[PDB]
Design an enzyme around this catalytic site. Structure first.
Site, PDB file in Angstrom:
ATOM      1  N   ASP A 533     -74.839  -8.635   5.453  1.00 14.91           N
ATOM      2  CA  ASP A 533     -74.437  -8.163   6.771  1.00 14.91           C
ATOM      3  C   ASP A 533     -73.611  -6.890   6.636  1.00 14.91           C
ATOM      4  O   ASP A 533     -72.675  -6.830   5.832  1.00 14.91           O
ATOM      5  CB  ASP A 533     -73.643  -9.239   7.512  1.00 14.91           C
ATOM      6  CG  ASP A 533     -72.358  -9.616   6.798  1.00 14.91           C
ATOM      7  OD1 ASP A 533     -71.318  -8.975   7.062  1.00 14.91           O
ATOM      8  OD2 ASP A 533     -72.386 -10.551   5.970  1.00 14.91           O
ATOM      9  N   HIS A 536     -74.139  -1.215   4.976  1.00 16.54           N
ATOM     10  CA  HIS A 536     -73.715   0.180   4.966  1.00 16.54           C
ATOM     11  C   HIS A 536     -72.213   0.333   4.768  1.00 16.54           C
ATOM     12  O   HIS A 536     -71.768   1.390   4.307  1.00 16.54           O
ATOM     13  CB  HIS A 536     -74.140   0.859   6.267  1.00 16.54           C
ATOM     14  CG  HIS A 536     -74.010  -0.017   7.475  1.00 16.54           C
ATOM     15  ND1 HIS A 536     -75.049  -0.789   7.946  1.00 16.54           N
ATOM     16  CD2 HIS A 536     -72.960  -0.257   8.297  1.00 16.54           C
ATOM     17  CE1 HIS A 536     -74.649  -1.459   9.013  1.00 16.54           C
ATOM     18  NE2 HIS A 536     -73.385  -1.153   9.246  1.00 16.54           N
ATOM     19  N   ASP A 668     -77.131 -12.068  16.364  1.00 22.06           N
ATOM     20  CA  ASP A 668     -76.063 -11.270  16.947  1.00 22.06           C
ATOM     21  C   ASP A 668     -76.431 -10.600  18.262  1.00 22.06           C
ATOM     22  O   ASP A 668     -75.524 -10.212  19.006  1.00 22.06           O
ATOM     23  CB  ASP A 668     -75.601 -10.179  15.966  1.00 22.06           C
ATOM     24  CG  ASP A 668     -74.653 -10.707  14.904  1.00 22.06           C
ATOM     25  OD1 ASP A 668     -75.118 -10.991  13.781  1.00 22.06           O
ATOM     26  OD2 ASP A 668     -73.446 -10.843  15.194  1.00 22.06           O
TER      27      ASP A 668
END
Ligand SMILES: OC[C@H]1O[C@H](O[C@H]2[C@H](O)[C@@H](O)[C@@H](O[C@H]3[C@H](O)[C@@H](O)[C@@H](O[C@H]4[C@H](O)[C@@H](O)[C@@H](O[C@H]5[C@H](O)[C@@H](O)[C@@H](O)O[C@@H]5CO)O[C@@H]4CO)O[C@@H]3CO)O[C@@H]2CO)[C@H](O)[C@@H](O)[C@@H]1O
Ligand SMILES: OC[C@H]1O[C@H](O[C@H]2[C@H](O)[C@@H](O)[C@@H](O)O[C@@H]2CO)[C@H](O)[C@@H](O)[C@@H]1O
Ligand SMILES: OC[C@H]1O[C@H](O[C@H]2[C@H](O)[C@@H](O)[C@@H](O)O[C@@H]2CO)[C@H](O)[C@@H](O)[C@@H]1O
Lengths: 1526, 67
Positions: A533, A536, A668
Site C-alpha cells: 500500500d 510510492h 478504499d
C-alpha cells in the site's frame, strides 16, 4: 529447448527499443518451466547481449551484472560479476546471461574513455516474472482473478473464514488478497499492526496454523494467497516501541521536528482546556469560525515565543558580543561590504560567522552567530572600541539578517492556521462528509500529529504518525528534514499508525531492519506474494532490500503495488528496481463514461490488425546460423520462446508497459451504490474482466454492499448469503478467461477495439493468432440519464454467436443489521432479442440490440474472424528458406531491388514501381522498397500511413509483389520464390481487410530476411560474419550487379553488369563505366567473394582495349567512347587485386579474350572479320598498356562531332598522352579535354562555358601515376615468379627501357615532383614556384598542368596513390599531408573535392541552374567543392596505413610480436564511419550517395546509391581483416 | 623464429605458433627442428593470473656453421 531473448545494445551501452510500446520495463514473459523441470535444472531465460563492433564501449569493455553465475549462488544486489567483451572491428560480440531464478537483475558496462580514464554507464534493469502454479496447472499472469478480503469481517474462527473461501471459489477467483493477518493495534485498523512477528491471537496462534490454512486454499479451492506488507508505519502502542523508540523519527533522530512537537502538544494541552473559555466550542457559524482563530491567535501563537527557531536572538547576541569582545579581534580580508549596501553586508556575516546548521529548523535556538568571528568583522569595519556605536551597528545587521526569516515565518504561520480552519470546517460545517462531535478526549480539534509515549528506557519521546500530503510529491519523505509539512500542518494523519524511520541502511536503525526482515520472510514462507500500500511513499533502497529478502525465501514472489508516483517514468523505475510484477489500477476512479472507456482502452491490448515485428535491414544475418527448416523445431511441452521465422534470430527483448491488475473496486474506494448506482456493478466488472490483464475485486462489490466499509470502526461480519448480485456473472467471466489463458501469450497476441457512445461502452477482445474473439456491449449506469439507443453494430468479415446477456435491477434498499453486513437485493434477469444478421455476400455481421436493454446490462458475443485458423501463422512462417534455396547473388537483385528504370528495361516501359496513394512509389521495385518504408511503420504501428490505408482498401499491392517476378521468372530460384509469395499472398487475401497490412508486412519481411540471409551465405566469411553496417555495405554489390536487356558488358550476350549507380546510371549506355567499375571491383566483388563475376568484368573490358586505354563509356562491345585517361590504370589495379585475393588468380593473365578492335588505332569495325580476328591474353594486354603509353599515344576521337560529345570542342577530341622519361610520370590531357574522374564539360550558354571543362586535369595526375608505380611493382615481382614474360618497353624515339629502371625512375622522382615541403628552406629540391602556392605539407594534385594554380590545389586524389603505391611516400611527409586532408578536405560523408580556402571554391552543385556563373550554372561545380563518398574510402584507407606507421600511439604489441593497430587508432577510424552508418540506416535507398553538398547537405542531383561510394568503404574493412584478423 | 622447413627463409621477427599440451601430471615436449646454422630465439606467451596476456624474455641459442 530455446529460452533465449536477444537484447541489442547501442554504441553507448543502452538497450535498443525494437518497438514503440511506450514507457515500459524490460520484462521477460511469464512462462512455465519445461515438462517436469524445477528451478535449477536449467536456466529460466538467457539474455543475449549484442554489443556493436568497434563501438566506444568495446575499448577494454566489461559487462557487469548482479546475475548469479549458477543456481547454487545466491543473489546479491551489489555483487556484480565480470564479463569480457570480445572487441572486433568487424564482428559483434554476444554475451549470454543465464538466469535461473526470477527476480530483479541489472547490468552496466565499464570501458576505457577517450581520455584513457575509466567510465561507467547507467544501470539497466530487467525483470523475470515469477511462475505461478496452484497444484500443477500453470496460471498465466494476465489470467489472475484476485478477491481481496478483510480479516476482521469474516468471523472469529478459521472455519468461519473457510465459508468465505467456498463462496469466492464458486465465483471462480483463483487468488485471494489478505489485509494483514497480524495482531492489530489500538484502533483495530488492519493497517496499524500491533506486532509484526505474530498473527491475530483471535484466530491463529502459530505460523503452522495459518500456513495450513493457506495450503488448504491451494489444494481445496485451487486458490493462491497473498497479503499486504506494511513498511511505512506500525501501531502506536507496540511494546517493542517502548524498548526501541529510535525506530521512528523523534527529537533525537530527527531534531527538525522539535518545533512541530511543541506545537502539537500545544493543542492537546489547548483542547483539554478549550471549552473553559470556548467561545464557539462546536457551532456551524461564520461568527463561530473566526473566534477559534482568535483563541489560537493569543493562546498558542502568541505563547510560542515569536518562534526563535528561525530568528537569531538579537539582544542575546549583543550580550554575547561585549562578553567575548577581546578574543579573535581582527579580519585581515577586504571583502567586507560597507554600510552603504545594508543588505549585502547582512548576508556576508551569514556566510562567515555562523555556527553549523544555520538557516534550518532544530532546537529552540538552532540558528546562531559565531561570536569571535562576528566581532572580528565589527572591529575591521567600524571600531575596535565597543561603545563606538557597535550596539547600534550589530543590532542593525542582525535585524536585517532576520528579515528573510521573519518573512519565512509569516508565510509559515498563515499556512498553519489556513490549513486549520479548512480541515476543521470539513469535519463540521462543510456538508460533504461531516461529523460535528463535541471535542472529547478521543476527538480533539487537532488531529494528533505526534504519538507521545513514556519509553521503557527511562525517557519520554514523541514519535509522529505518517499520512499523506494533499497534492505533494509522494517521493519526498514528509518526515525527513527536507519537508516542513509537520510544522505547517500540511499532513492528513493516521493516529492509528506511527513513523518507521529507515535510514541509508541498517546502520541508521539496526533493530527496525532486523525486525522487518524477519517479518517479511515470515509471510514469504506461507503466502505466494505481497501487496504494498502506497508503495510510492516507501523509499527505494528500503523496498529493494526487503523484497529481495522475500524472493530469497519465496523465489516465485508475486508483487502488487498501488503505485502513483510523479509520472510514468518513475512508475517504470520502481517496477524496474523493486521487481514489481503488477500495478493496481482502479476502475471506480472514472468520473464519467468517457474516462472509463479511456481507462479500459489503456489495459485492453493493442489495436486490431496491429503490425508484427520482424528482423529487417537493421539486423546481422550470420551465414553460420541455425535454421528451422519448416518452423518445426518446437514442442509445446518445452515451453520455449519462439523465433520470428525460420531464421533463428531469437525473440527480441524490448521495453513493455508494466503489467496491470485492474480492480473494478478496491477496499478504499466508494461503492458503485455511492459514486454511481448499484446497476453499474454489472457493466463495470464486465468491461474490466474483458481487459487483457490481471483483474480483481473487493468482497462486497459482487455482493452489492451498500456503502464502503469503514476499515477502522466497523465490526460486522460478511453475509453468508450465497449467489447474490454478480456472483453468477463473475463465475462466467472468470471461467471464460480460463479458456483464453491457454494460448494467449505475448503483447502482440491479444488485440482490442473499444468504442464509447454516450452511456454504452463497446469492447472487442481479439486473439491475433486464431481469430477467436469476444464482443461486449455494456450499458453503463453512472446516473439515470434516460433512454438512449445504440446504432447498428457492424463487424467486417466476422461471424458472431450469442453467448450470454444479463441485466441488474434493484429491488429496494439493503437491510440494516448490527451483526452481519448484508447487500442490496438485486435481480439478475437474462435478456433476449439480440438479432445477429450475417450477409453471405459481404461477409459482414450486423448486431441489433433489443429495446429492452436497460442501463446496468451487458451482452457477450463469441466472434470469429473469417479466413483465420490456428494454422495460419505456421503457413506464413515456413517454406521461405526452401524457396530461396536456388537463389544466386544475381537473382536476389530482381527479388529485392530493381529501380523503376531497371524495371522499365525488362518491361519495355509498361510496369515500374507501385504507386502508393498520397505518398509516392517505393524506392526499389523489389522487397527492399517495401522494407525501407515498413520499418518505421512497424516500429510505430502506424496503421494510418498511406501504405497501411492502401493495403486494406484493396489487394493491389499484394498482387503487385507476386506479379513483378513474371519478368524474371526464368532466373535462378526466382520461380520458387514467386510461388512462395503467390501461395502466401493468396492466403492473405482471404483475410479481413483491416488485417491485410499487418500480414503483408509480415510476409514481405520474412522473404526479405531469407533473401538477405541467402546473400550472406553465398558471400565470403569476412562479410558473412560482420556487423549490420558491413553487411549493409555488402548488399550494395547485389544492387549493382544485374543482367539487363538494353545493355551488358558483352556485345554478344546479356549477362551481369555492374551499374555505376541507381537509378540514373542503370540503363542503356549509362550503366557501365570503365573507371567506375574497376574502382569498385575490389570492394563489391573481391571483398565479398564474387570472384567469377569479377573475372567477367575484367575480360569484357579487356576486349575493349584501344589506344592502350580502357574506355570510359563501355557500350557492351559497340561504340565505346575513349574519353578516358584514368580507366586503364584502375583496370590494371583491379587485375592485381584479382591475382592477390583470388586463390590461383595468377591464371587470369593467361585467359584469352577476343579483341573486338584492331591492334592499331583505326576505326569501328563492329560488323567485320576484325571482330573475332585475333585473341589477346591478359598478359599481353597489360604489356600493351605499359608500352603504348611509353611509346607515346596520339589520337583524335573517332566519329567526333554532334554524334559524340555535343559540347566538346574540336581541339578536345585530339587527345595525346606521353611519358616524361626524365621522371617516369605519364602526362596527358588539355584544357579542352576532361579525361579524369573529374569529368564535367561545361554546357551553360548563359555563362559561356559550352565545351569548357570545369576541372580539366592535364599533365601528371597523382592518381594516374600512383597506379603506374603500382603496376610496375606488380609486373616486376610477377616476372620473378615466371608469370610475366615481358621485361623491356620501347620509348618514342626507339630506345628500350628496362621495367625496373622505369620503376626506379618513379621511386627517385615522384615525391620530388609532387611534394610541397613544409619548410621554405627545402624549396630548391622539390620543384616549386613559391609565388603560386596555397598550403605547405601538401602533395600536389597535378604536375605541369595548364592552370598553374590547379597544380597546388588541395584535392583528395593524392590518397589514391598513397593506397596503391605507398613506397613513393616517405612516412613523415605522407602522414602530415593526410592529416591536413582530415582537418580541411574531410566532410562528414563525402570528401571535399577542393580546398575551401581556394577562390574557385563553390561547394554547391545544382545541375540545371541557368545563370551567368562560370561555376554554379549547369553543374560546373561537380568537382570544385562538393563532397564525394568514394574519395573518403581511399582517404581513410591511407589515413589508417600511415597513422599506423608514424604515430607510436596507433600501435600495440600484438600476437607473435607482429604490431597491430592500437585501440586508439581503431577509435579514430570508427568515429570517421559513424556518419556513413547513419546514412545507409536512414536512407530509403539501401546504400551511400554519390555526392553531397557542403557539410553533409543532401544534394538532390546526386545519385542516392553509387557502386564505388560503398565499394571504397568495403576496401577498408578488407584491409583490417586480411592483415590482422588471423 | 625458427623456419618450419628448409624451404622457408629465416626472418628475425616472424615467429611461429606451437601449442603447449597442458597437463597436471605429464610434462610436455615440443621439438624445434633446425635446418640451417644461425641465430634463433624463443619466448613464451601465457594467460596471466589476472586473465591477461603475458610474455617472457627472448631466449637465444646459436647453431654453429659447418666448416
Ligand atoms: O548515343 C548515346 C549518347 O551519345 C552521346 O553522348 C554524349 C552526351 O550527349 C554529351 O553531352 C556528353 O555527356 C557527358 C558530359 O559531356 C560530361 O561532361 C559528363 O557529364 C556529367 C554531367 O554534367 C553531370 O550533370 C552528371 O549527369 C547526371 C546528372 O547530374 C544527374 O542529376 C542526372 O540528370 O543524370 C545525369 C546523367 O544522366 O554526371 C555526368 C557524368 O556522369 O559525362 C557525360 C556522359 O559521358 O558526352 C557523351 C558521350 O559523347 C550523345 O550526345 C547523346 O545524346 C546520346 O544519348
Ligand atoms: O495499381 C492499381 C491501383 O489500384 C487502385 O486504384 C483504384 C482506386 O479505386 C483509385 O485509385 C481509383 O482512382 O483508381 C482505381 C479504381 O479502382 C489504387 O488506389 C492505386 O493506388 C493502385 O495503383
Ligand atoms: O597572396 C597569396 C594569396 O593566397 C590565397 O589565395 C590563393 C587563391 O585562393 C587560390 O585560388 C590560388 O589559386 O591563388 C592564390 C594563391 O595563394 C589567399 O586566399 C589570399 O588571401 C592570398 O592573398
Amino acid at each position: 529447448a530455446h529460452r533465449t531473448l536477444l537484447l541489442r545494445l547501442s554504441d553507448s551501452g543502452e538497450p535498443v527499443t525494437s518497438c514503440s510500446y511506450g514507457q515500459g520495463v524490460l520484462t521477460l514473459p511469464s512462462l512455465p518451466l519445461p515438462q517436469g523441470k524445477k528451478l535449477g535444472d536449467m536456466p529460466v531465460y538467457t539474455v543475449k547481449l549484442a554489443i556493436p563492433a568497434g563501438s566506444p564501449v568495446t575499448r577494454d569493455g566489461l559487462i557487469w551484472t548482479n546475475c548469479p553465475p549458477d543456481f547454487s549462488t545466491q543473489f546479491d544486489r551489489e555483487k556484480f560479476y565480470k564479463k569480457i567483451i570480445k572487441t572486433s572491428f568487424h564482428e559483434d560480440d554476444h554475451i549470454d546471461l543465464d538466469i535461473y531464478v526470477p527476480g530483479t537483475y541489472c547490468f552496466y558496462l565499464s570501458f576505457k574513455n577517450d581520455k584513457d580514464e575509466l567510465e561507467t554507464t547507467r544501470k539497466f534493469y530487467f525483470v523475470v516474472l515469477p511462475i505461478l502454479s496452484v497444484n500443477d496447472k500453470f496460471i498465466p499472469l494476465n489470467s489472475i482473478a484476485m478477491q481481496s478480503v478483510v480479516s476482521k469481517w469474516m468471523g472469529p474462527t478459521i472455519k468461519d473464514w473457510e465459508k468465505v473461501f467456498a463462496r469466492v471459489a464458486s465465483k471462480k477467483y483463483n487468488m485471494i488478497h489478505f489485509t494483514p493477518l497480524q495482531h492489530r493495534g489500538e484502533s483495530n485498523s488492519p493497517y496499524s499492526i500491533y506486532d509484526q512477528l505474530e498473527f491475530d491471537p483471535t484466530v491463529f496462534k502459530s505460523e503452522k496454523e495459518v500456513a495450513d490454512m493457506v495450503e488448504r486454499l491451494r489444494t481445496e479451492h485451487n486458490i493462491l494467497s497473498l497479503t499486504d506488507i506494511v513498511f511505512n508505519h506500525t501501531a502506536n502502542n507496540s511494546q517493542w516501541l517502548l524498548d526501541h523508540p529510535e525506530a521512528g523519527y523523534n527529537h533525537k533522530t530527527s531534531p527538525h521536528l522539535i518545533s512541530a512537537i511543541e506545537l502539537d502538544k500545544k493543542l492537546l494541552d489547548f483542547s483539554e482546556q478549550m471549552e473553559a473559555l470556548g467561545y464557539p466550542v462546536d457551532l456551524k457559524t461564520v461568527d463561530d469560525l473566526i473566534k477559534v482563530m482568535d483563541g489560537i491567535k493569543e493562546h498558542v501563537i502568541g505563547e510560542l515565543k515569536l518562534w526563535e527557531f528561525y530568528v537569531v536572538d538579537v539582544k542575546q547576541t549583543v550580550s554575547e558580543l561585549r562578553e567575548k569582545w577581546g578574543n579573535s579581534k581582527s579580519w585581515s580580508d577586504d571583502n567586507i561590504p560597507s554600510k552603504d549596501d545594508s543588505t549585502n553586508l547582512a548576508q556576508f556575516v551569514r556566510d562567515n560567522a555562523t555556527e553549523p546548521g544555520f538557516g534550518s529548523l532544530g532546537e529552540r535556538g538552532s540558528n546562531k552567530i559565531n561570536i569571535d568571528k562576528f566581532a572580528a568583522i565589527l572591529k575591521k569595519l567600524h571600531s575596535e572600541d565597543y561603545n563606538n556605536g557597535i550596539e547600534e551597528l550589530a543590532t542593525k545587521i542582525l535585524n536585517d539578517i532576520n528579515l528573510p526569516f521573519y518573512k519565512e515565518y509569516d508565510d509559515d504561520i498563515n499556512e498553519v492556521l489556513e490549513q486549520l480552519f479548512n480541515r476543521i470546517k470539513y469535519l463540521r460545517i462543510d456538508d460533504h462528509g461531516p461529523k460535528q462531535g463535541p471535542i472529547t478526549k478521543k476527538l480533539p480539534l487537532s488531529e494528533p500529529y505526534f504519538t507521545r509515549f513514556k519509553a521503557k528506557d527511562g525517557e519520554e519521546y514523541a514519535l509522529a504518525n505518517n499520512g499523506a500530503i494533499w497534492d505533494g510529491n509522494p517521493l519526498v519523505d514528509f518526515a525527513s528534514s527536507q519537508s516542513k509539512a509537520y510544522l505547517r500542518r500540511e499532513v492528513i494523519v493516521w493516529g492509528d499508525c506511527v513513523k518507521l524511520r529507515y535510514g541509508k541502511g541498517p546502520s541508521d536503525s539496526p533493530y527496525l531492519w532486523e525486525r522487518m526482515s524477519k517479518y517479511v520472510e515470515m509471510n514469504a514462507r506461507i503466502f505466494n506474494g505481497f501487496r504494498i500500500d502506497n508503495c510510492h511513499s516507501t523509499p527505494l533502497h528500503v523496498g529493494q532490500y526487503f523484497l529481495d529478502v522475500a524472493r530469497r525465501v519465496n523465489p516465485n514472489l508475486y508483487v502488487v503495488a498501488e503505485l502513483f508516483s510523479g509520472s510514468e517514468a518513475m512508475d517504470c523505475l520502481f517496477v524496474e528496481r523493486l521487481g514489481i510484477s503488477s500495478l493496481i489500477r482502479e476502475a471506480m476512479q472514472a468520473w464519467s463514461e468517457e474516462e472509463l472507456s479511456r481507462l479500459v482502452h489503456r489495459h485492453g491490448g493493442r489495436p486490431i490488425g496491429s503490425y508484427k515485428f520482424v528482423p529487417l535491414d537493421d539486423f546481422p544475418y550470420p551465414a553460420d546460423v541455425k535454421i528451422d527448416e519448416e518452423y518445426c523445431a518446437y514442442n509445446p511441452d518445452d515451453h520455449s520462446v519462439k523465433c520470428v521465422s525460420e531464421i533463428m534470430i531469437p525473440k527480441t527483448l524490448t521495453a513493455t508497459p508494466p503489467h496491470a491488475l485492474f480492480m473494478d473496486c478496491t477496499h478504499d474506494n466508494e461503492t458503485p451504490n455511492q459514486k454511481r448506482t448499484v446497476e453499474d456493478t454489472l457493466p463495470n466488472a464486465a468491461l474490466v474482466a474483458f481487459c487483457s490483464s490481471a483483474i480483481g475485486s473487493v468482497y462486497g462489490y459482487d455482493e452489492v454492499f451498500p456503502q464502503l466499509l469503514d476499515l477502522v470502526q466497523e465490526k460486522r461480519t460478511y453475509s453468508c448469503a450465497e449467489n447474490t448480485g454478480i456472483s453468477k456473472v463473475k463465475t462466467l467471466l472468470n471461467n471464460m478467461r480460463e479458456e483464453i489463458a491457454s494460448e494467449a501469450v505475448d503483447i502482440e497476441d491479444s488485440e482490442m477495439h473499444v468504442h464509447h457512445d454516450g452511456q454504452y461502452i463497446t469492447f472487442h477482445r481479439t486473439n491475433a493468432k486464431n481469430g477467436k474473439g469476444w464482443y461486449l456491449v455494456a450499458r453503463t449506469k453512472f446516473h439515470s440519464s434516460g433512454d438512449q439507443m445504440l446504432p447498428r453494430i457492424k463487424l467486417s468479415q466476422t461471424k458472431a454467436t450469442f453467448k450470454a446477456a444479463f441485466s441488474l435491477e434493484r429491488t429496494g434498499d439493503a437491510p440494516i443489521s448490527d451483526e452481519i453486513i448484508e447487500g442490496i437485493p438485486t435481480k439478475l434477469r437474462e435478456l433476449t432479442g439480440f438479432d445477429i444478421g450475417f450477409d453471405e455476400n459481404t461477409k459482414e455481421t450486423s448486431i441489433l440490440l433489443p429495446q429492452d436493454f436497460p442501463q446496468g446490462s451487458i451482452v457477450i458475443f463469441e466472434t470469429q474472424q473469417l479466413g483465420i485458423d490456428d494454422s495460419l501463422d505456421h503457413f506464413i512462417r515456413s517454406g521461405a528458406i526452401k524457396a530461396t534455396e536456388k537463389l544466386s547473388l544475381e537473382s536476389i537483385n530482381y527479388v529485392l531491388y530493381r529501380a523503376e528504370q531497371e524495371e522499365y528495361d525488362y518491361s519495355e516501359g509498361r510496369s515500374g514501381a507501385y504507386d502508393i496513394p498520397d505518398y509516392g512509389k517505393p524506392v526499389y521495385c523489389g522487397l527492399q522498397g517495401w522494407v525501407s518504408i515498413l520499418r518505421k511503420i512497424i516500429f510505430y504501428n502506424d496503421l494510418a500511413h498511406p501504405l497501411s490505408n492502401n493495403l486494406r482498401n484493396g489487394h493491389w499491392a499484394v498482387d503487385y509483389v507476386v506479379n513483378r517476378l513474371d519478368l524474371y521468372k526464368d532466373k535462378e530460384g526466382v520461380a520458387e520464390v514467386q510461388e512462395w509469395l503467390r501461395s502466401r499472398m493468396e492466403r492473405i487475401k482471404q483475410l479481413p481487410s483491416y488485417l491485410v497490412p499487418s500480414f503483408f508486412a509480415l510476409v514481405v519481411g520474412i522473404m526479405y530476411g531469407c533473401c538477405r540471409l541467402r546473400a550472406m551465405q553465398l558471400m565470403s566469411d569476412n562479410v558473412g560474419k560482420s556487423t549490420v553496417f558491413v553487411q549493409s555495405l555488402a548488399m550494395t554489390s547485389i544492387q549493382m550487379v544485374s543482367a539487363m536487356k538494353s545493355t551488358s558488358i558483352l556485345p554478344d550476350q546479356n549477362i551481369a553488369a555492374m551499374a555505376a549507380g541507381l537509378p540514373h546510371f542503370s540503363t542503356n549506355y549509362m550503366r557501365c563505366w570503365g573507371r567506375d567499375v574497376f574502382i569498385s571491383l575490389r570492394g563489391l566483388l573481391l571483398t565479398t567473394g564474387r570472384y567469377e563475376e569479377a573475372k567477367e568484368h575484367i575480360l569484357a573490358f579487356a576486349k575493349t582495349l584501344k589506344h592502350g586505354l580502357i574506355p570510359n563509356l563501355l557500350d557492351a562491345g559497340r561504340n565505346p567512347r575513349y574519353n578516358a585517361r584514368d580507366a586503364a590504370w584502375f583496370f590494371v589495379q583491379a587485375i592485381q587485386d584479382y591475382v592477390t585475393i583470388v586463390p590461383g588468380g595468377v591464371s587470369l593473365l593467361q585467359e584469352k579474350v577476343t579483341r573486338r578492335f584492331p591492334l592499331d588505332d583505326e576505326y569501328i569495325p563492329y560488323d567485320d572479320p576484325k571482330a573475332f580476328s585475333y585473341s589477346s591474353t591478359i598478359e599481353e594486354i597489360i604489356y600493351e598498356i605499359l608500352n603504348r603509353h611509353a611509346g607515346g599515344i596520339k589520337y583524335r576521337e573517332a566519329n567526333a562531332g554532334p554524334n559524340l560529345d555535343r559540347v566538346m570542342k574540336d581541339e578536345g577530341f585530339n587527345v595525346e598522352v606521353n611519358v616524361d622519361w626524365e621522371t617516369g610520370l605519364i602526362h596527358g590531357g588539355s584544357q579542352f579535354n576532361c579525361g579524369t574522374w573529374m569529368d564535367k564539360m561545361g554546357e551553360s550558354e548563359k555563362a559561356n562555358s559550352v565545351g569548357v571543362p570545369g576541372t580539366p586535369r592535364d599533365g601528371a595526375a597523382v592518381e594516374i601515376n600512383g597506379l603506374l608505380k603500382s603496376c610496375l611493382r606488380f609486373v616486376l615481382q610477377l616476372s620473378k615468379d615466371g608469370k610475366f614474360k615481358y621485361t623491356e618497353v620501347t620509348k618514342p624515339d626507339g630506345s628500350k627501357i628496362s621495367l625496373s629502371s622505369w620503376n626506379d625512375l618513379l621511386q627517385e622522382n615522384f615525391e620530388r615532383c609532387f611534394y610541397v615541403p613544409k619548410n621554405k628552406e627545402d624549396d630548391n629540391k622539390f620543384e616549386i614556384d613559391a609565388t603560386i602556392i596555397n598550403r605547405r605539407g601538401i602533395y600536389k594534385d597535378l604536375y605541369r598542368s595548364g592552370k598553374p594554380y590547379e597544380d597546388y590545389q588541395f584535392r583528395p586524389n593524392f590518397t589514391i596513390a598513397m593506397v596503391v603505391a605507398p613506397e613513393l611516400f616517405t612516412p613523415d611527409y605522407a602522414a602530415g599531408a593526410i592529416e591536413l586532408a582530415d582537418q580541411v578536405l574531410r566532410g562528414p560523408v563525402g570528401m571535399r573535392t577542393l580546398d575551401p580556402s581556394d577562390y574557385n571554391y563553390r561547394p554547391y552543385y545544382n545541375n540545371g541552374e541557368d545563370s551567368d556563373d562560370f561555376a554554379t550554372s549547369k553543374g560546373r561545380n561537380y568537382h570544385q567543392g562538393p563532397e564525394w563518398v568514394w574519395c573518403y574510402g581511399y582517404f581513410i584507407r591511407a589515413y589508417h596505413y600511415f597513422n599506423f606507421l608514424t604515430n607510436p600511439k596507433c600501435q600495440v604489441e600484438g600476437s607473435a610480436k607482429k604490431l597491430k593497430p592500437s585501440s586508439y587508432l581503431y577509435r579514430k577510424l570508427y568515429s570517421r564511419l559513424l556518419k556513413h552508418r547513419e546514412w545507409i540506416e536512414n536512407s530509403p535507398w539501401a546504400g551511400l550517395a554519390e555526392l553531397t553538398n557542403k557539410d553533409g547537405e543532401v544534394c538532390n542531383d546526386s545519385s542516392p546509391t553509387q557502386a564505388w561510394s560503398t565499394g571504397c568503404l568495403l576496401d577498408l574493412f578488407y584491409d583490417l581483416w586480411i592483415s590482422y584478423e588471423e
